[PDB]
Write a protein that binds this DNA or RNA. Structure first.
Ligand SMILES: [Zn+2]
Ligand SMILES: [Zn+2]
Length: 96
DNA sequence: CTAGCCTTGACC
DNA sequence: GGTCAAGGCTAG
């Protein structure tokens, strides 16, 4: 589906385990790269959509985890390019 | 911090 | 050599 499972924005490709928008790709990568830790200021279940996703990073990252984005696809040694161990996992979603 | 566009590079 | 998901860069 053309819709980001985190926020509903236009999907730009497989990112970190599944189809996501460009923004949720960037956000997940920044968070995991730098071990960022956020605070929800309401009740830890804010609605995430294209126009609210900036408002609560905590609940945005919670939802990234929840829909299945993978911490392991973020690379510790920051190598660019090539293909990770999910390259073949992306094969069977392109069949489903 | 955000998010669009750019560059890399192992796999095929 | 081409693909396309990694990481990189930078206005705003
Ligand atoms: Zn998204
Ligand atoms: Zn929240």
């Amino acid at each position: 589906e053309e819709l980001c499972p985190v926020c509903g924005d236009k999907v730009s490709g497989y990112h970190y385990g599944l189809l996501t928008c460009e923004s949720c790709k960037g956000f997940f990568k920044r968070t995991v790269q730098n071990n960022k830790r956020y605070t929800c200021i309401e009740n830890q279940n804010c609605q995430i959509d294209k126009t609210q996703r900036k408002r609560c990073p905590y609940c945005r990252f919670q939802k990234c985890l929840s829909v299945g984005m993978k911490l392991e696809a973020v690379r510790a040694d920051r190598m660019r390019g090539g293909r990770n161990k999910f390259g073949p996992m992306y094969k069977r979603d392109r069949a489903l």
